PDB file of C-alpha atoms in Angstrom:
ATOM      1  CA  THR A 149      -0.052  -0.054  -0.087  1.00  0.00           C
ATOM      2  CA  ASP A 150       2.607   2.168   1.068  1.00  0.00           C
ATOM      3  CA  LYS A 151       4.487   1.802  -2.432  1.00  0.00           C
ATOM      4  CA  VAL A 152       1.487   2.252  -4.290  1.00  0.00           C
ATOM      5  CA  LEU A 153       0.928   5.463  -2.107  1.00  0.00           C
ATOM      6  CA  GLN A 154       4.360   6.955  -2.980  1.00  0.00           C
ATOM      7  CA  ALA A 155       4.046   5.630  -7.074  1.00  0.00           C
ATOM      8  CA  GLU A 156       0.427   7.092  -7.383  1.00  0.00           C
ATOM      9  CA  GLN A 157       1.832  10.399  -5.339  1.00  0.00           C
ATOM     10  CA  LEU A 158       4.909  10.793  -7.955  1.00  0.00           C
ATOM     11  CA  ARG A 159       2.703   9.881 -10.604  1.00  0.00           C
ATOM     12  CA  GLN A 160       0.188  13.032 -10.005  1.00  0.00           C
ATOM     13  CA  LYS A 161       3.244  15.070  -9.043  1.00  0.00           C
ATOM     14  CA  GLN A 162       4.251  14.622 -12.548  1.00  0.00           C
ATOM     15  CA  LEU A 163       0.813  15.031 -13.683  1.00  0.00           C
ATOM     16  CA  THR A 164       0.132  18.285 -11.702  1.00  0.00           C
ATOM     17  CA  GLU A 165       3.619  19.749 -13.364  1.00  0.00           C
ATOM     18  CA  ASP A 166       2.492  18.536 -16.830  1.00  0.00           C
ATOM     19  CA  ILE A 167      -0.620  20.027 -16.426  1.00  0.00           C
ATOM     20  CA  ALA A 168       0.622  23.318 -15.146  1.00  0.00           C
ATOM     21  CA  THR A 169       3.350  23.074 -17.983  1.00  0.00           C
ATOM     22  CA  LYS A 170       0.543  22.884 -20.596  1.00  0.00           C
ATOM     23  CA  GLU A 171      -0.973  25.844 -19.070  1.00  0.00           C
ATOM     24  CA  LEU A 172       2.168  27.744 -19.644  1.00  0.00           C
ATOM     25  CA  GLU A 173       1.878  26.423 -22.996  1.00  0.00           C
ATOM     26  CA  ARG A 174      -1.145  27.700 -23.901  1.00  0.00           C
ATOM     27  CA  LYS A 175      -0.620  31.243 -22.140  1.00  0.00           C
ATOM     28  CA  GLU A 176       2.050  31.646 -24.435  1.00  0.00           C
ATOM     29  CA  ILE A 177       0.001  31.048 -27.434  1.00  0.00           C
ATOM     30  CA  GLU A 178      -2.524  33.543 -25.962  1.00  0.00           C
ATOM     31  CA  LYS A 179       0.407  35.577 -26.093  1.00  0.00           C
ATOM     32  CA  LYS A 180       1.205  34.533 -29.921  1.00  0.00           C
ATOM     33  CA  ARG A 181      -1.689  36.202 -30.742  1.00  0.00           C
ATOM     34  CA  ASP A 182      -1.043  39.520 -29.809  1.00  0.00           C
ATOM     35  CA  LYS A 183       0.961  40.053 -32.589  1.00  0.00           C
ATOM     36  CA  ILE A 184      -1.965  39.163 -34.922  1.00  0.00           C
ATOM     37  CA  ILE A 185      -4.677  40.978 -33.211  1.00  0.00           C
ATOM     38  CA  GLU A 186      -2.679  44.074 -33.231  1.00  0.00           C
ATOM     39  CA  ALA A 187      -1.585  43.892 -36.881  1.00  0.00           C
ATOM     40  CA  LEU A 188      -4.966  43.451 -38.267  1.00  0.00           C
ATOM     41  CA  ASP A 189      -6.218  46.268 -35.990  1.00  0.00           C
ATOM     42  CA  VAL A 190      -3.439  48.657 -37.306  1.00  0.00           C
ATOM     43  CA  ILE A 191      -4.527  47.388 -41.011  1.00  0.00           C
ATOM     44  CA  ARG A 192      -8.303  48.326 -39.738  1.00  0.00           C
ATOM     45  CA  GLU A 193      -8.087  51.950 -40.803  1.00  0.00           C
ATOM     46  CA  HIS A 194     -10.768  51.568 -43.763  1.00  0.00           C
ATOM     47  CA  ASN A 195     -14.685  50.736 -42.961  1.00  0.00           C
ATOM     48  CA  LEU A 196     -17.562  51.769 -45.840  1.00  0.00           C
ATOM     49  CA  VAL A 197     -16.745  55.415 -46.139  1.00  0.00           C
ATOM     50  CA  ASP A 198     -12.994  55.293 -47.036  1.00  0.00           C
ATOM     51  CA  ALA A 199     -13.812  53.510 -49.805  1.00  0.00           C
ATOM     52  CA  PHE A 200     -15.090  56.955 -50.836  1.00  0.00           C
ATOM     53  CA  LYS A 201     -12.373  58.646 -49.392  1.00  0.00           C
ATOM     54  CA  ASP A 202      -9.985  57.036 -51.592  1.00  0.00           C
ATOM     55  CA  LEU A 203     -12.470  57.287 -54.653  1.00  0.00           C
ATOM     56  CA  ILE A 204     -12.557  60.824 -54.599  1.00  0.00           C
ATOM     57  CA  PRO A 205      -8.913  61.985 -54.304  1.00  0.00           C
ATOM     58  CA  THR A 206      -7.993  59.694 -56.956  1.00  0.00           C
ATOM     59  CA  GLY A 207     -10.837  61.910 -58.486  1.00  0.00           C
ATOM     60  CA  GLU A 208      -8.700  64.989 -57.253  1.00  0.00           C
ATOM     61  CA  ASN A 209      -6.602  66.451 -60.505  1.00  0.00           C
ATOM     62  CA  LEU A 210      -3.654  69.553 -60.022  1.00  0.00           C
ATOM     63  CA  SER A 211      -3.435  70.925 -63.747  1.00  0.00           C
ATOM     64  CA  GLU A 212      -6.353  71.512 -66.250  1.00  0.00           C
ATOM     65  CA  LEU A 213      -6.112  73.186 -69.536  1.00  0.00           C
ATOM     66  CA  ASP A 214      -9.527  72.089 -70.980  1.00  0.00           C
ATOM     67  CA  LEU A 215      -8.185  70.307 -74.091  1.00  0.00           C
ATOM     68  CA  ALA A 216      -6.327  67.733 -75.992  1.00  0.00           C
ATOM     69  CA  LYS A 217      -6.699  65.483 -72.462  1.00  0.00           C
ATOM     70  CA  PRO A 218     -10.185  64.150 -72.769  1.00  0.00           C
ATOM     71  CA  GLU A 219      -8.390  60.794 -71.492  1.00  0.00           C
ATOM     72  CA  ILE A 220      -4.939  61.223 -71.099  1.00  0.00           C
ATOM     73  CA  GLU A 221      -5.548  62.810 -67.652  1.00  0.00           C
ATOM     74  CA  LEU A 222      -8.330  59.805 -67.473  1.00  0.00           C
ATOM     75  CA  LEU A 223      -5.310  57.138 -67.436  1.00  0.00           C
ATOM     76  CA  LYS A 224      -3.880  58.292 -64.405  1.00  0.00           C
ATOM     77  CA  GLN A 225      -7.197  58.698 -62.803  1.00  0.00           C
ATOM     78  CA  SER A 226      -8.288  54.891 -63.399  1.00  0.00           C
ATOM     79  CA  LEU A 227      -4.617  53.307 -63.013  1.00  0.00           C
ATOM     80  CA  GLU A 228      -4.703  55.098 -59.082  1.00  0.00           C
ATOM     81  CA  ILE A 229      -8.344  53.549 -58.901  1.00  0.00           C
ATOM     82  CA  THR A 230      -6.759  50.369 -59.828  1.00  0.00           C
ATOM     83  CA  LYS A 231      -3.894  51.027 -57.384  1.00  0.00           C
ATOM     84  CA  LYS A 232      -6.541  51.936 -54.385  1.00  0.00           C
ATOM     85  CA  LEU A 233      -8.076  48.428 -55.289  1.00  0.00           C
ATOM     86  CA  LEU A 234      -5.463  46.719 -55.424  1.00  0.00           C
ATOM     87  CA  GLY A 235      -4.117  48.055 -52.611  1.00  0.00           C
ATOM     88  CA  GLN A 236      -7.422  46.847 -50.453  1.00  0.00           C
ATOM     89  CA  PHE A 237      -7.172  43.273 -52.262  1.00  0.00           C
ATOM     90  CA  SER A 238      -3.528  42.415 -50.851  1.00  0.00           C
ATOM     91  CA  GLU A 239      -3.979  43.574 -47.404  1.00  0.00           C
ATOM     92  CA  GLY A 240      -7.254  41.930 -47.489  1.00  0.00           C
ATOM     93  CA  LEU A 241      -5.717  38.682 -48.513  1.00  0.00           C
ATOM     94  CA  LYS A 242      -3.057  39.277 -45.488  1.00  0.00           C
ATOM     95  CA  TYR A 243      -6.339  39.746 -43.454  1.00  0.00           C
ATOM     96  CA  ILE A 244      -7.671  36.396 -44.476  1.00  0.00           C
ATOM     97  CA  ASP A 245      -4.090  34.822 -43.650  1.00  0.00           C
ATOM     98  CA  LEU A 246      -3.967  36.239 -40.134  1.00  0.00           C
ATOM     99  CA  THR A 247      -7.783  35.399 -39.602  1.00  0.00           C
ATOM    100  CA  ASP A 248      -6.583  31.554 -41.060  1.00  0.00           C
ATOM    101  CA  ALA A 249      -3.847  31.790 -38.106  1.00  0.00           C
ATOM    102  CA  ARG A 250      -6.224  33.137 -35.768  1.00  0.00           C
ATOM    103  CA  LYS A 251      -8.342  30.183 -36.203  1.00  0.00           C
ATOM    104  CA  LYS A 252      -4.748  27.851 -36.142  1.00  0.00           C
ATOM    105  CA  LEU A 253      -4.123  29.153 -32.673  1.00  0.00           C
ATOM    106  CA  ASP A 254      -7.578  29.033 -31.358  1.00  0.00           C
ATOM    107  CA  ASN A 255      -7.787  25.305 -32.112  1.00  0.00           C
ATOM    108  CA  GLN A 256      -4.243  24.832 -30.297  1.00  0.00           C
ATOM    109  CA  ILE A 257      -5.971  26.311 -27.297  1.00  0.00           C
ATOM    110  CA  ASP A 258      -8.800  24.287 -27.605  1.00  0.00           C
ATOM    111  CA  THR A 259      -7.053  20.945 -27.916  1.00  0.00           C
ATOM    112  CA  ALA A 260      -4.959  22.283 -25.104  1.00  0.00           C
ATOM    113  CA  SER A 261      -7.926  22.770 -23.389  1.00  0.00           C
ATOM    114  CA  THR A 262      -9.197  19.478 -23.949  1.00  0.00           C
ATOM    115  CA  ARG A 263      -6.145  18.132 -22.922  1.00  0.00           C
ATOM    116  CA  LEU A 264      -6.313  20.232 -19.663  1.00  0.00           C
ATOM    117  CA  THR A 265      -9.584  18.567 -18.885  1.00  0.00           C
ATOM    118  CA  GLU A 266      -8.806  15.092 -19.412  1.00  0.00           C
ATOM    119  CA  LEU A 267      -5.639  15.203 -17.362  1.00  0.00           C
ATOM    120  CA  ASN A 268      -7.334  17.159 -14.589  1.00  0.00           C
ATOM    121  CA  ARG A 269     -10.153  14.346 -14.690  1.00  0.00           C
ATOM    122  CA  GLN A 270      -7.309  11.646 -14.206  1.00  0.00           C
ATOM    123  CA  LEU A 271      -5.985  14.110 -11.659  1.00  0.00           C
ATOM    124  CA  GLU A 272      -9.033  14.126  -9.646  1.00  0.00           C
ATOM    125  CA  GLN A 273      -9.244  10.610  -9.940  1.00  0.00           C
ATOM    126  CA  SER A 274      -5.654  10.080  -8.597  1.00  0.00           C
ATOM    127  CA  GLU A 275      -7.125  12.545  -5.910  1.00  0.00           C
ATOM    128  CA  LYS A 276      -9.564  10.052  -5.221  1.00  0.00           C
ATOM    129  CA  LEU A 277      -7.041   7.222  -5.124  1.00  0.00           C
ATOM    130  CA  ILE A 278      -4.532   8.927  -2.969  1.00  0.00           C
ATOM    131  CA  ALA A 279      -7.437  10.407  -0.759  1.00  0.00           C
ATOM    132  CA  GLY A 280      -8.477   6.767   0.122  1.00  0.00           C
ATOM    133  CA  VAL A 281      -5.055   5.601   0.465  1.00  0.00           C
ATOM    134  CA  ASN A 282      -4.138   8.023   3.120  1.00  0.00           C
ATOM    135  CA  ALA A 283      -7.870   7.567   4.638  1.00  0.00           C
ATOM    136  CA  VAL A 284      -7.014   3.879   5.005  1.00  0.00           C
ATOM    137  CA  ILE A 285      -3.562   4.485   6.600  1.00  0.00           C
ATOM    138  CA  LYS A 286      -4.780   7.039   8.944  1.00  0.00           C
ATOM    139  CA  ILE A 287      -7.422   4.059   9.573  1.00  0.00           C
ATOM    140  CA  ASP A 288      -4.417   1.900  10.185  1.00  0.00           C
ATOM    141  CA  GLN A 289      -3.174   3.966  12.855  1.00  0.00           C
ATOM    142  CA  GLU A 290      -6.228   4.673  14.522  1.00  0.00           C
ATOM    143  CA  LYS A 291      -6.687   0.423  14.114  1.00  0.00           C
ATOM    144  CA  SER A 292      -3.384   0.390  16.030  1.00  0.00           C
ATOM    145  CA  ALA A 293      -4.618   2.761  18.591  1.00  0.00           C
ATOM    146  CA  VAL A 294      -7.679   0.439  19.133  1.00  0.00           C
ATOM    147  CA  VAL A 295      -5.148  -2.113  19.539  1.00  0.00           C
TER     148      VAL A 295
ATOM    149  CA  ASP B 258     -13.349  39.749 -34.242  1.00  0.00           C
ATOM    150  CA  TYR B 259     -16.587  39.144 -35.759  1.00  0.00           C
ATOM    151  CA  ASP B 260     -17.348  43.099 -36.330  1.00  0.00           C
ATOM    152  CA  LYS B 261     -13.996  43.569 -37.538  1.00  0.00           C
ATOM    153  CA  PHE B 262     -14.915  40.408 -40.203  1.00  0.00           C
ATOM    154  CA  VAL B 263     -17.950  42.326 -41.153  1.00  0.00           C
ATOM    155  CA  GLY B 264     -16.345  45.637 -41.200  1.00  0.00           C
ATOM    156  CA  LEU B 265     -13.706  43.980 -43.726  1.00  0.00           C
ATOM    157  CA  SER B 266     -15.606  42.373 -45.626  1.00  0.00           C
ATOM    158  CA  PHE B 267     -17.894  44.847 -46.544  1.00  0.00           C
ATOM    159  CA  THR B 268     -14.899  46.736 -47.386  1.00  0.00           C
ATOM    160  CA  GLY B 269     -13.754  43.828 -49.632  1.00  0.00           C
ATOM    161  CA  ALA B 270     -17.483  44.066 -50.978  1.00  0.00           C
ATOM    162  CA  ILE B 271     -17.893  47.486 -51.801  1.00  0.00           C
ATOM    163  CA  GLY B 272     -15.033  47.759 -54.486  1.00  0.00           C
ATOM    164  CA  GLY B 273     -15.479  46.059 -57.661  1.00  0.00           C
ATOM    165  CA  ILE B 274     -17.429  43.987 -59.610  1.00  0.00           C
ATOM    166  CA  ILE B 275     -14.916  40.825 -59.180  1.00  0.00           C
ATOM    167  CA  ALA B 276     -14.626  42.060 -55.322  1.00  0.00           C
ATOM    168  CA  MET B 277     -17.748  42.143 -54.797  1.00  0.00           C
ATOM    169  CA  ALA B 278     -18.171  38.292 -56.136  1.00  0.00           C
ATOM    170  CA  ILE B 279     -15.305  36.907 -54.685  1.00  0.00           C
ATOM    171  CA  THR B 280     -15.889  38.999 -51.105  1.00  0.00           C
ATOM    172  CA  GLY B 281     -19.559  37.988 -50.942  1.00  0.00           C
ATOM    173  CA  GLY B 282     -19.049  34.616 -51.920  1.00  0.00           C
ATOM    174  CA  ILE B 283     -16.964  33.882 -49.451  1.00  0.00           C
ATOM    175  CA  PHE B 284     -17.275  36.150 -46.456  1.00  0.00           C
ATOM    176  CA  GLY B 285     -20.770  36.964 -47.188  1.00  0.00           C
ATOM    177  CA  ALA B 286     -21.475  33.649 -46.316  1.00  0.00           C
ATOM    178  CA  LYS B 287     -18.681  32.954 -43.551  1.00  0.00           C
ATOM    179  CA  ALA B 288     -20.367  36.097 -41.670  1.00  0.00           C
ATOM    180  CA  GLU B 289     -23.765  34.419 -41.544  1.00  0.00           C
ATOM    181  CA  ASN B 290     -22.272  31.173 -40.493  1.00  0.00           C
ATOM    182  CA  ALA B 291     -19.532  32.323 -38.233  1.00  0.00           C
ATOM    183  CA  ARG B 292     -22.266  34.435 -36.597  1.00  0.00           C
ATOM    184  CA  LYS B 293     -24.817  31.848 -36.290  1.00  0.00           C
ATOM    185  CA  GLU B 294     -22.184  29.579 -34.506  1.00  0.00           C
ATOM    186  CA  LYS B 295     -20.941  32.231 -32.553  1.00  0.00           C
ATOM    187  CA  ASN B 296     -24.543  33.322 -31.167  1.00  0.00           C
ATOM    188  CA  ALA B 297     -25.192  29.595 -30.586  1.00  0.00           C
ATOM    189  CA  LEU B 298     -21.839  29.898 -28.566  1.00  0.00           C
ATOM    190  CA  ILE B 299     -23.333  32.781 -26.538  1.00  0.00           C
ATOM    191  CA  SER B 300     -26.549  30.604 -25.986  1.00  0.00           C
ATOM    192  CA  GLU B 301     -24.391  27.789 -24.823  1.00  0.00           C
ATOM    193  CA  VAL B 302     -22.414  29.786 -22.299  1.00  0.00           C
ATOM    194  CA  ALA B 303     -25.545  31.863 -21.262  1.00  0.00           C
ATOM    195  CA  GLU B 304     -27.053  28.541 -20.598  1.00  0.00           C
ATOM    196  CA  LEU B 305     -23.988  27.660 -18.301  1.00  0.00           C
ATOM    197  CA  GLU B 306     -24.757  30.632 -16.326  1.00  0.00           C
ATOM    198  CA  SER B 307     -28.294  29.398 -16.562  1.00  0.00           C
ATOM    199  CA  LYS B 308     -26.628  25.800 -15.159  1.00  0.00           C
TER     200      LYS B 308
ATOM    201  CA  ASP C 198     -16.325  73.861 -37.398  1.00  0.00           C
ATOM    202  CA  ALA C 199     -18.690  72.622 -40.115  1.00  0.00           C
ATOM    203  CA  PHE C 200     -18.365  75.898 -41.551  1.00  0.00           C
ATOM    204  CA  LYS C 201     -14.923  76.255 -40.823  1.00  0.00           C
ATOM    205  CA  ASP C 202     -14.811  73.346 -43.119  1.00  0.00           C
ATOM    206  CA  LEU C 203     -17.035  74.885 -45.485  1.00  0.00           C
ATOM    207  CA  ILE C 204     -14.659  77.894 -46.207  1.00  0.00           C
ATOM    208  CA  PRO C 205     -11.608  76.495 -46.449  1.00  0.00           C
ATOM    209  CA  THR C 206     -12.899  74.742 -49.142  1.00  0.00           C
ATOM    210  CA  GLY C 207     -14.706  77.384 -50.479  1.00  0.00           C
ATOM    211  CA  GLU C 208     -11.451  79.045 -50.711  1.00  0.00           C
ATOM    212  CA  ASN C 209      -9.071  78.964 -53.961  1.00  0.00           C
ATOM    213  CA  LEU C 210      -5.598  79.954 -55.164  1.00  0.00           C
ATOM    214  CA  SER C 211      -5.412  80.356 -58.774  1.00  0.00           C
ATOM    215  CA  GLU C 212      -8.164  82.415 -60.556  1.00  0.00           C
ATOM    216  CA  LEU C 213      -8.220  83.018 -64.186  1.00  0.00           C
ATOM    217  CA  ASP C 214     -12.021  84.400 -64.805  1.00  0.00           C
ATOM    218  CA  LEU C 215     -12.720  82.316 -67.414  1.00  0.00           C
ATOM    219  CA  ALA C 216     -12.581  78.710 -68.963  1.00  0.00           C
ATOM    220  CA  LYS C 217     -13.169  77.247 -65.651  1.00  0.00           C
ATOM    221  CA  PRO C 218     -16.380  78.052 -64.394  1.00  0.00           C
ATOM    222  CA  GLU C 219     -17.233  74.369 -63.072  1.00  0.00           C
ATOM    223  CA  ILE C 220     -13.819  73.067 -63.614  1.00  0.00           C
ATOM    224  CA  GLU C 221     -12.606  74.656 -60.768  1.00  0.00           C
ATOM    225  CA  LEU C 222     -15.948  73.730 -58.863  1.00  0.00           C
ATOM    226  CA  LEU C 223     -15.130  69.716 -59.415  1.00  0.00           C
ATOM    227  CA  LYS C 224     -12.374  70.327 -56.628  1.00  0.00           C
ATOM    228  CA  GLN C 225     -14.944  72.569 -54.829  1.00  0.00           C
ATOM    229  CA  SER C 226     -17.709  69.647 -54.343  1.00  0.00           C
ATOM    230  CA  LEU C 227     -15.107  66.822 -54.228  1.00  0.00           C
ATOM    231  CA  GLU C 228     -13.337  68.204 -51.308  1.00  0.00           C
ATOM    232  CA  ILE C 229     -16.624  69.114 -49.511  1.00  0.00           C
ATOM    233  CA  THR C 230     -17.519  65.503 -50.259  1.00  0.00           C
ATOM    234  CA  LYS C 231     -13.913  64.708 -48.729  1.00  0.00           C
ATOM    235  CA  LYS C 232     -14.584  66.916 -45.415  1.00  0.00           C
ATOM    236  CA  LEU C 233     -18.483  65.395 -45.113  1.00  0.00           C
ATOM    237  CA  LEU C 234     -17.221  61.550 -45.449  1.00  0.00           C
ATOM    238  CA  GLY C 235     -14.828  62.508 -43.135  1.00  0.00           C
ATOM    239  CA  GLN C 236     -17.182  63.507 -40.404  1.00  0.00           C
ATOM    240  CA  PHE C 237     -18.835  60.537 -41.614  1.00  0.00           C
ATOM    241  CA  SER C 238     -16.230  57.289 -40.419  1.00  0.00           C
ATOM    242  CA  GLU C 239     -15.261  58.712 -37.531  1.00  0.00           C
ATOM    243  CA  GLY C 240     -18.822  59.545 -36.570  1.00  0.00           C
ATOM    244  CA  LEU C 241     -19.468  56.139 -37.009  1.00  0.00           C
ATOM    245  CA  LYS C 242     -16.194  54.939 -34.976  1.00  0.00           C
ATOM    246  CA  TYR C 243     -17.473  57.762 -31.980  1.00  0.00           C
ATOM    247  CA  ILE C 244     -21.243  55.427 -32.782  1.00  0.00           C
ATOM    248  CA  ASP C 245     -18.673  52.496 -32.284  1.00  0.00           C
ATOM    249  CA  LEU C 246     -16.824  53.196 -29.219  1.00  0.00           C
TER     250      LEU C 246
END
């Protein structure tokens, strides 16, 4: 019984250390997402109005001469329109990529939490084990007292 | 995140023709799907509070 | 400050009295819409916060 006692005590000690280690791991994963949320926040600078607030300054001009560039001036117009559009696209793609990274690290957090739950259930099982062992040892002491 | 998701999905929408196409196809559906799943999670944690 | 935005968009630098009756007014109206939509998006962020 005492060998079982010490073996299960060392066992649940290793289990507790490993659970704390996994908690440190998932906390570090939660530290990792800080760069992702800050990156997609500092990219988040345009919302539903700023598209028009890009459509207007590309509609702006500096020099005008009323003839001989009906569409030659419009070349720069259309090309800067496509500039602002494709500037929204690639940043949108990077947004997609970092949200997929968010889903990936959240999957990591979820799997770590399931490991936490299962190992804590095993830890409580070993609590029941070692509690009954300590109880019957205390009984044995009280048994010797009644002896 | 979801409020930022619908914001960025709508910006990816309102740009142009194929922008509307690809972004309203993908995240126009993903907004509704992740929102319904998210509100199901809202209901689950509310029931855990209720439990 | 809405009027103190309506006036400097009404300002100008170069004038020539002909040949831009409305061509000068293009920049006028577009900067009006700039200042308006600058008030909108910040108003939306105000709503959000």
